[PDB]
Ligand binder design. Structure first.
Ligand SMILES: CCCCCCCCCCCCCCCCCC(=O)OC[C@H](CO[C@@H]1O[C@H](CO[C@H]2O[C@H](CO)[C@H](O)[C@H](O)[C@H]2O)[C@H](O)[C@H](O)[C@H]1O)OC(=O)CCCCCCCCCCCCCCCCC
Ligand SMILES: CCCCCCCCCCCCCCCCCC(=O)OC[C@H](CO[C@@H]1O[C@H](CO[C@H]2O[C@H](CO)[C@H](O)[C@H](O)[C@H]2O)[C@H](O)[C@H](O)[C@H]1O)OC(=O)CCCCCCCCCCCCCCCCC
Ligand code: CLA
Ligand code: CLA
Ligand code: CLA
Ligand code: CLA
Ligand SMILES: CCCCCCCCCCCCCCCCCC(=O)OC[C@H](CO[C@@H]1O[C@H](CO)[C@H](O)[C@H](O)[C@H]1O)OC(=O)CCCCCCCCCCCCCCCCC
Ligand SMILES: CCCCCCCCCCCCCCCC(=O)OC[C@H](COP(=O)(O)OC[C@@H](O)CO)OC(=O)CCCCCCCCCCCCCCC
Ligand SMILES: CC1=C(/C=C/C(C)=C/C=C/C(C)=C/C=C/C=C(C)/C=C/C=C(C)/C=C/C2=C(C)CCCC2(C)C)C(C)(C)CCC1
Ligand SMILES: CC1=C(/C=C/C(C)=C/C=C/C(C)=C/C=C/C=C(C)/C=C/C=C(C)/C=C/C2=C(C)CCCC2(C)C)C(C)(C)CCC1
Ligand SMILES: CC1=C(/C=C/C(C)=C/C=C\C(C)=C\C=C\C=C(C)\C=C\C=C(C)\C=C\C2=C(C)CCCC2(C)C)C(C)(C)CCC1
Ligand code: OEX
Ligand SMILES: [Cl-]
Ligand SMILES: [Fe+2]
Lengths: 333, 54, 31, 76, 34, 33, 450, 37, 341
């Protein structure tokens, strides 16, 4: 045989501790470089001028932060959507002043997660499985891409992306609420229903399966020891569990098929997350949620308020105080 | 620079040379095993996946 | 005539029709 | 027994329902259109939010004298 | 700065070529039902 | 003896006309700005 | 009946259109019927938009997405972007509506009455999903048709009336493009450009000559490729890398169409040459630049010298410098300094905005355009309110740019999901384990322990 | 407004654009007619 | 035998719906709570307590109607129909806000009855009662917020209102006044909820993508007899796949399902503690060190201070209309505001 054939046989081998595959060639370097840069920048980075008004903001541990308030600041507003690699700065100090590491981390990270999906499919193929797990994983990837890349593209600046921090996430959420009126977009309601229903069904399924265990342990050992690796037993007792579910609610509602059950379980949260990601992506292009301000009037013509007006007051309060020194003109276009 | 529109970001000869070096090195390694292919009408197949050895 | 299902379904159904009629009537009110 | 799948078919079911349901629907319509709900529940009418004397919102300020306060605020 | 760009381009093209020529080496045949 | 694919059609017509009426009332009348 | 039940093919009713994979007679009818539906919608939408036209408001204040394309092609538009007549739109709608009937009848016939398979009486119109020569032939034929279409667009742009040009010397007007650019360096620098800010990849075309030259080159390339793929068969390096089945081809098409949808949405959002602003409305950056220009003009008229006015941060209230040196508008709109519009270029010199021209060379029409674009920014809500999120119900307007961008972005993402699903299934079925794990010979049980 | 010779047909024109959806609903109706064979 | 035995035999018979002894507590209270919400969102107003319109009869839609809390002048009254505030007079009872108390009070007992029903059915069929600890989670959430939060505050007026937009108002209100996102208990609740959603999706795709070939048609749904002895999917293949992709994987089928049960309930029970803490204004608002440094050094800035400024803006611009009974009057010159807008 040749050298290339041996290399290919080693790459696609299903006997290593961790599968490599051809997608792993793009996966591993990008994720590793993103991790290294993120750790170093989170620990020891200097303040970054995020808004382009020459007012740097500290975000690293060594400059007086804690775990909660630390972050990696997005790039400067003066840059916009321009590409800013290291070799385009006159010095490393200038590169760090304008928020260089954010772009590097984000780009290598997104490439890494795409390769992660590909690698999942590849191992599924090599193991003789059915190839539909990476489709399920595509939803968190879609949401992360939506925020990190799509929102800056629509708004025209990397500085509007979500900061890589804990309190930066809250700041992003609050400003997004103030500017786009989320919580009134039906796609956000779809996402909330998705997560709540996912938690509900996880708890219900766990309870039902755990309650229907046959007797193999008696008292003085954890019940988990009954199951053996490779044992043959369907994940319930049909009589007890089916009767319990058919008696708890009306008898017409009971899943007697494991396939349909475990399909519904997979389908619900994935669809919810897809819809909420598309909601964020569409709101990136200034298509906001429902507007119900001053919609109820009496006979004379005066305005009677509703709860939407209280929400509007909160939105105005958030809006008038964000980026205090950044605006010069009456409209925030 | 940043705002200019050069192809693939190439602004110097050395960048092009090293790109050629990379594609060509991996290409030579690949040709070390797939370089003896023929287009004769007996190496073809009738199916969805090519199992005809090399 | 007095089964449990009768009582449940009618107790859930009569006010539903009443309220739906009320809402449809509300739809044509103008100030 | 006698499930819904063939309950939906019985002709007597259909005829008694056609006799009964429209009466309830019209009763609800008349309940709204007569204006009786405004008096039962105390909801102000579209021309009753502000009276000629009171031009502000009528908030209740006392616990044990809510009856007299509401009687004042409504019309008096 | 120029040398850093040279090295980064080298690494990127190397890994991308690895990917491209790896998927061209009769990949659909590498399944357990061969 | 209605078959079990026409009564569902009647129910669908009823629900769709109710929803359409509610949307129209949303666009016209009380609470329409 | 055979071929239309689960017991004979699997494929329960909710996935019944998958029973047509190996039936080449009904598939033709299905595809023709969908084409007829598309033509019908085009004609009906044109007619509906024509019926509601009002000659006072601009086209972007009436919620139209179909009249703008015909107007850009040079039908019924005059100087400055005013609509003069609507007869050609009526003619286009009528022709589409009439052709839809023929297409639908053909689909219905070929689907309900014609032979189930064409591989027994019409050998020319037959295939096997695995005969590579036939697939290449079909691809080449329809590719040559695409090239002919591109050349037809070029011919319309050059000889048959001309196209609307928003950069015309004296305001937008219909003119003949007599000198298209043909130097391959420019076109293939457009193709091989980076997509980030300042470059924009192919969205950044900013004149009609480049557009016509590009469509010329595309026509030439498509014709040549069609002939080549007709007269040849796939080479060795391609045979060992692809999967040869119908679902694989479907997934291949799905990925490309998703990419095209993304590209079109970004065209609609950012470009203002093929989507002139007089018809679709101002772009995102354009409204902010207009606001800055309007307030600069007002403050200068009041008496200020707007070159040395200091802002709250000391950076410059009206004018400043971009990170490369050019003079740009101040404020939060420093991110949109890449904008180029026909109503701003009169004030731009060799190094950005010109101080003297700004001082004493601003015409009233520019002021009016700036005010209009400032007050008609692309911001709105789902129920068509218009304005910032904290505004009250007074106007009813959402720009067509937002609608087009959001819709085709949604479609692009879901068709990418299509690539993933249909391709994974195609490859798994080709390998032979899409039904499940063979319990007799589970492959995992014969691997070295980990 | 449509050309004067066709203004009478305006109500039909106001309904054409939505026809392509009724087709999608008709597919489900046809499937339900044969009892989801 | 006696009356007790006959009634007990009748109550546990196999019917369309199980009734049981707990049905007496469950059915009336739940029915009354649902009916109260349905009539409140349709006919009753909030004009005299909040100064708002919150019914269909006034012009609201599904997303803006609610059953609002009672007036602030009635601190923690039980608001009985025959109490010293209404003294009968259904109309005055509706006008002062008795429907909210009606709904909450009968609904708490409805929840208790549902938990008792779960216990009873589990005992009847002879299985361990694990679906009654999983429901205790949501019981803790409801009790904690809807009862303990108002009881520590001034009055019932500061409770969530039964509506869609009222809940959004509640969220924004707690963020603005308590800095609720910074509390380390909502954090653990978020972690629990998101982990539950993740677990639900990964299992159904893992189970659905390791099925044994037990059929001949592409529709794998009709390849499962209602219950057999063999498992429908391969545990070994799933273990291998997930241990070679992620580096760690499950191997015990009981631990998997117990983990699925455990995560979200733990999240909810954790968030309840933080809400109970907020009830007494014992919040996690300030980092004193950063406040001191920012006061001394007028160049130190993090995202923390920006969030603080946002909260100040929320409070100042919302309090005037959110609490109409305080007669707040803020001149335009005292409202905090940035430049331009
Ligand atoms: C291909 C590589 C894909 C990765 C792209 C990421 C960055 C895309 C980007 O910043 O895209 C923006 C560019 C548009 O570029 C803009 O192009 C503009 C062109 O306008 C110029 O030209 C116009 C012509 O009149 C006007 O004159 C205008 O004033 C003038 O500025 C400017 O140059 C802007 O600075 C520049 O940002 O679009 C594009 O490159 C074209 C579209 C690329 C394909 C779409 C990318 C895929 C979608 C993003 C990924 C989604 C992932 C989630 C999916 C789930
Ligand atoms: C199932 C969910 C979808 C059904 C929604 C309910 C249908 C009826 C309600 C509705 O629709 O609403 C009723 C409206 C008709 O209402 C009229 O809609 C008008 C729309 O305004 C338009 O016209 C105005 C001036 O005419 C302005 O120009 C404004 O910008 C422009 O949008 C105004 O709001 C009128 O006041 C109002 O009466 O139906 C419409 O418009 C008809 C169009 C609906 C089908 C079009 C598909 C949606 C367009 C693709 C968008 C993809 C979504 C984005 C990506 C996600
Ligand atoms: C664009 C949409 C579209 C199209 C073109 C088709 C086309 C087709 N489907 Mg299909 N399908 C669709 C959507 C579509 N489907 C959807 C959404 C579903 C899910 C509900 C299905 C579910 C489905 C199943 C389950 C099956 C098909 C089958 C078929 C094929 C035979 C149908 C047949 O025998 O008709 C029989 C129907 C009739 C005789 C009644 C309809 C008569 C006409 C068409 C009504 C319309 C006439 C029109 C209004 C008047 C035009 C006049 C003109 C002169 C202008 C055919 C190629 C079958 C197949 O594979 O066959 C091998 C099959 O088993 N489909
Ligand atoms: C892409 C479009 C398309 C394609 C590939 C076909 C292909 C075909 N059609 Mg068809 N057809 C179409 C659109 C199409 N049709 C439309 C739109 C209509 C409506 C006007 C018809 C109406 C139609 C009729 C009425 C008949 C066909 C027939 C045929 C077959 C023989 C054609 C022949 O001998 O011409 C050879 C031409 C050049 C070599 C062939 C399979 C015939 C058939 O199959 O009869 C059994 C036939 O009688 N077609
Ligand atoms: C819709 C557009 C389209 C599609 C799908 C294809 C598809 C294909 N082309 Mg093709 N081609 C096209 C347009 C297209 N071509 C055009 C417009 C040209 C002219 C520039 C060419 C010039 C071309 C050449 C020169 C070759 C291909 C080849 C191929 C095959 C392998 C391509 C690959 O894996 O990369 C594949 C069947 C290769 C092949 O297999 O040869 C038969 C090959 O050598 N194509
Ligand atoms: C299981 C049945 C049940 C239960 C537990 C409750 C529980 C409640 N209801 Mg309710 N209610 C019910 C059925 C029920 N309801 C039904 C069926 C109706 C319709 C007729 C009502 C109509 C109703 C109204 C109209 C009101 C309540 C109210 C209340 C609350 C206070 C009641 C009170 O003071 O208790 C009183 C305690 C007792 C009566 C103890 C019972 C007496 C003992 C057993 C015997 C003593 C004999 C003595 C020596 C003589 C409480 C949460 C009030 C409320 O929510 O205010 C906010 C209120 O105004 N209920
Ligand atoms: C489909 C994919 C087929 C390829 C399979 C390989 C997938 C590999 C995954 C791609 C990762 C490699 C991306 C790194 C390259 C990079 O970021 O370049 C980033 C460079 C930007 O280059 C920057 O340019 C600046 C401008 O002056 C400066 O010069 C900077 O120094 C320079 O770095 O952009 C490009 O090279 C883009 C050119 C190619 C884009 C058009 C593609 C042509 C074909 C279109 C079809 C695809 C759409
Ligand atoms: C006024 C004084 C009224 C006291 C009468 C109670 C009679 C119970 C006798 C019944 C009796 O003798 O039989 C004992 C009874 C079982 O009744 P059976 O009818 O099955 O029994 C018949 C025989 O088996 C023996 O009684 O046991 C019970 O469950 C006790 C009842 C619960 C307790 C009920 C009383 C508590 C509520 C009192 C009402 C409140 C008043 C204030
Ligand atoms: C018209 C026009 C224009 C344009 C022009 C042109 C010329 C274009 C071109 C275009 C083009 C020219 C495109 C191309 C593309 C390509 C592609 C898109 C490719 C892809 C690839 C692939 C897909 C592959 C894959 C793979 C791999 C990776 C390896 C192995 C495996 C496989 C094979 C799968 C302009 C702008 C000037 C102006 C306007 C008008
Ligand atoms: C409070 C009170 C009370 C009680 C009352 C009651 C009990 C009532 C009931 C009531 C009721 C019980 C009512 C109900 C109503 C209902 C309704 C109103 C419904 C509606 C519906 C709808 C509208 C739906 C919708 C939908 C959905 C959701 C989905 C699908 C689609 C549709 C559209 C169908 C009494 C007497 C004790 C006295 C004291 C006070
Ligand atoms: C153009 C034109 C026209 C028209 C025509 C057309 C083309 C039409 C046809 C077509 C159509 C337009 C048809 C449609 C129909 C549809 C329907 C009406 C459907 C219904 C639906 C439903 C009701 C459904 C339901 C259901 C069922 C049954 C079962 C399952 C579930 C569901 C819910 C889905 C005319 C004559 C005027 C003449 C002039 C021109
Ligand atoms: O960068 Mn971030 O936050 Ca979107 O609004 Mn305008 O720009 Mn600024 O202000 Mn508001
Ligand atoms: Cl600004
Ligand atoms: Fe399991």
């Amino acid at each position: 045989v040749s050298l290339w054939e041996r290399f290919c046989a080693w790459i696609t081998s299903t006997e290593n501790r961790l599968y490599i595959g051809w997608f792993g060639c793009l996966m591993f370097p990008t994720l590793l470089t993103a991790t290294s840069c993120f750790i170093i920048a989170f620990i020891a980075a200097p303040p970054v001028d995020i808004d382009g008004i020459r007012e740097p903001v500290a975000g690293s541990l060594l400059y007086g932060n804690n775990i909660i308030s630390g972050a990696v600041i997005p790039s400067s507003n003066a840059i916009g959507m321009h590409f800013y690699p290291i070799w385009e700065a006159a010095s490393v100090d200038e590169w760090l002043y304008n928020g260089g590491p954010y772009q590097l981390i984000v780009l290598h990270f997104l490439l890494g997660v795409a390769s992660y999906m590909g690698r999942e499919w590849e191992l599924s193929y090599r193991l003789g499985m059915r190839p539909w797990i990476f489709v399920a994983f595509s939803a968190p990837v879609a949401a992360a891409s939506a925020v990190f890349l799509v929102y800056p593209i629509g708004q025209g600046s990397f500085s509007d992306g979500m900061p890589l921090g804990i309190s930066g996430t809250f700041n992003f959420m609050l400003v997004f609420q103030a500017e786009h009126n989320i919580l009134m977009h039906p796609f956000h309601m779809a996402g909330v229903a998705g997560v709540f229903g996912g938690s509900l069904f996880s708890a219900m399924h766990g309870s039902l399966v755990t309650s229907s265990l046959i007797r193999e342990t008696t008292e003085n050992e954890s019940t988990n020891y009954g199951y053996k690796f490779g044992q043959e037993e369907e994940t319930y007792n049909i009589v007890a569990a089916h009767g319990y579910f058919g008696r708890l609610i009306f008898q017409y509602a009971s899943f007697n098929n494991s396939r349909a059950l475990h399909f519904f379980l997979a389908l619900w949260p994935v669809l919810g997350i897809w819809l909420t990601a598309m909601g964020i992506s569409t709101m990136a292009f200034n298509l906001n949620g429902f507007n119900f301000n001053q919609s109820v009037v009496d006979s004379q013509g005066r305005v009677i308020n509703t709860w939407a007006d209280i929400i509007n007051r909160a939105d105005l309060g958030m809006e008038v105080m964000h980026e205090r020194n950044a605006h010069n003109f009456p409209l925030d276009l | 620079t940043e705002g200019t529109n050069e192809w693939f970001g190439v602004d110097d000869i050395r960048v092009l040379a090293v790109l050629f070096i990379g594609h060509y090195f991996i290409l030579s390694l690949w040709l070390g095993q797939y370089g003896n292919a023929t287009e004769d009408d007996d190496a073809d197949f009738f199916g969805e996946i090519d199992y005809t050895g090399s | 005539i007095f089964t449990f299902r009768w009582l449940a379904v009618h107790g859930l159904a009569i006010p539903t029709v009443f309220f739906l009629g009320g809402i449809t009537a509300m739809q044509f009110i103008q100030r | 027994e006698r499930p819904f799948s063939d309950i939906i078919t019985s002709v007597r079911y259909w005829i008694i329902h056609t006799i009964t349901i429209p009466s309830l629907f019209v009763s609800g319509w008349l309940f709204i259109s007569t204006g009786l709900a405004y008096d039962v529940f105390g909801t102000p009418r579209p021309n009753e939010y502000f009276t000629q004397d009171r031009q502000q919102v009528p908030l209740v300020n006392d616990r044990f004298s809510a009856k007299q306060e509401l009687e004042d605020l409504t019309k008096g | 700065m120029l040398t850093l760009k040279i090295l980064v381009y080298t690494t990127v093209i190397f890994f991308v070529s690895l990917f491209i020529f790896g998927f061209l080496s009769s990949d659909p045949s590498r399944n357990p039902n061969r | 003896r209605v078959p079990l694919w026409l009564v569902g059609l009647v129910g669908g017509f009823a629900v769709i006309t109710i929803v359409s009426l509610f949307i129209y009332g949303s666009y016209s009348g009380l609470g329409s700005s | 009946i055979a071929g239309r039940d689960i017991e004979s093919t699997g494929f329960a009713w909710w996935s019944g259109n998958a029973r047509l994979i190996n039936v080449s007679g009904k598939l033709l009818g299905a595809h023709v019927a969908h084409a007829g539906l598309m033509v019908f919608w085009a004609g009906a939408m044109i007619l509906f938009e024509v019926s509601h036209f009002v000659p006072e408001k601009p086209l972007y204040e009436q919620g139209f997405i179909c009249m703008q394309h015909l107007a850009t092609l040079g039908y019924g538009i005059g100087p400055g972007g005013e609509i003069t007549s609507t007869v050609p739109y009526f003619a286009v709608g009528v022709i589409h509506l009439i052709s839809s009937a023929v297409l639908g009848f053909g689909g219905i016939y070929h689907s309900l009455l014609g032979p189930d398979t064409l591989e027994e009486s019409f050998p020319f119109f037959g295939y096997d999903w695995r005969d590579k020569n036939k697939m290449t032939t079909i691809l080449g034929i329809h590719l040559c048709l695409l090239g002919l279409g591109a050349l037809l667009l070029v011919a319309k742009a050059m000889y048959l009336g001309g196209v609307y040009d928003t950069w015309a010397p004296g305001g937008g007007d219909v003119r003949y493009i007599t000198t298209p650019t043909l130097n391959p360096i420019v076109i293939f620098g457009y193709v091989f450009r980076s997509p980030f800010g300042g470059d924009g990849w192919v969205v950044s075309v900013n004149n009609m000559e480049d557009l016509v030259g590009g469509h010329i080159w595309v026509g030439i390339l498509c014709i040549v490729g069609g002939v080549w793929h007709i007269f040849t068969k796939p080479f060795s390096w391609a045979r060992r890398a692809f999967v040869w089945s119908g679902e694989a081809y479907l997934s291949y098409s799905l990925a490309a169409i998703s990419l095209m949808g993304f590209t079109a949405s970004l065209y609609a959002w950012y470009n203002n040459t093929a989507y002139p602003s007089e018809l679709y409305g101002p772009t995102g950056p354009e409204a902010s630049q207009s606001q800055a220009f309007t307030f600069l003009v007002r403050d200068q008229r009041l008496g200020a010298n707007v070159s040395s006015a200091q802002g709250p941060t000391g950076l410059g209230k009206y004018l400043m410098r971009s990170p490369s040196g050019e003079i740009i508008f101040g404020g939060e709109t420093m991110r949109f300094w890449d904008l180029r519009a026909p109503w701003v270029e009169p004030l731009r010199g060799p190094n950005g905005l010109d101080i003297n021209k700004i001082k004493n060379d601003i015409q009233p029409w520019q002021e009016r355009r700036a005010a209009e674009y400032m007050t008609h920014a692309p911001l709105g809500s789902l129920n068509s309110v218009g304005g910032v999120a904290t505004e009250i119900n007074s106007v009813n307007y959402v720009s067509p740019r937002s609608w087009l961008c959001c819709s085709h972005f949604f479609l692009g993402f879901f068709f990418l999901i299509g690539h993933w699903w249909h391709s994974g299934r195609a490859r798994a079925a080709a390998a032979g384990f899409e039904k499940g794990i063979n319990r007799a010979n589970e492959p995992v049980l014969s691997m070295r322990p980990i | 407004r449509l050309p004067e010779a066709y203004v009478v047909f305006s109500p039909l024109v106001d309904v054409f654009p939505v026809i392509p959806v009724f087709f999608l609903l008709l597919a489900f109706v046809w499937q339900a007619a044969v009892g989801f064979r | 035998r006696g009356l007790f035995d006959l009634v007990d035999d009748w109550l546990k018979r196999d019917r369309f719906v199980f009734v049981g002894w707990s049905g007496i507590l469950l059915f009336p209270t739940a029915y009354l709570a649902a009916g109260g919400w349905f009539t409140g969102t349709t006919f009753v107003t909030s004009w005299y307590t909040h100064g708002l319109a919150s019914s269909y009869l006034e012009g609201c839609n599904f997303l803006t109607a609610a059953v609002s809390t009672p007036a602030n002048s009635m601190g923690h009254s039980l608001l009985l129909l025959w109490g010293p505030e209404a003294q009968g007079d259904f109309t005055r009872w509706c006008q002062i806000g008795g429907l909210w108390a009606f709904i909450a009070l009968h609904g708490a007992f409805g929840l208790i009855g549902f938990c008792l029903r779960q216990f009873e059915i589990a005992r009847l069929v002879g299985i361990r009662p694990y679906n009654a600890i999983a429901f205790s989670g949501p019981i803790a959430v409801f009790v904690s917020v809807f009862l303990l939060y108002p009881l520590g505050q001034a009055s019932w007026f500061f409770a969530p209102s039964f509506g869609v937009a009222a809940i959004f108002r509640f969220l924004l209100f707690l963020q603005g006044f308590h800095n609720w996102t910074l509390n380390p208990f909502h954090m653990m609740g978020v972690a629990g909820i998101l982990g539950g959603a993740l677990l639900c999706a990964i299992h159904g795709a893992t189970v659905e993508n390791t099925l044994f070939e037990d059929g001949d048609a592409a529709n794998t749904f009709r390849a499962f007899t209602p219950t057999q002895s063999e498992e429908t999917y391969s545990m070994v293949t799933a273990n291998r796949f997930w241990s070679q992709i992620f580096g760690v994987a499950f191997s015990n089928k009981r631990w998997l399902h117990f983990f699925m049960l455990f995560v979200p309930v733990a999240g909810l029970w954790t968030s309840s503690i933080g809400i109970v803490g907020l009830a007494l204004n014992l919040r996690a608002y300030d980092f004193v060190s950063q406040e001191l440094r920012a006061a001394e050094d007028p160049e130190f800035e993090t995202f923390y201070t920006k969030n603080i400024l946002l909260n100040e803006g929320i409070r100042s611009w919302m309090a005037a209309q959110d609490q109409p009974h305080e007669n707040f009057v803020f001149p335009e010159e005292v409202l905090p505001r940035g430049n331009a807008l």
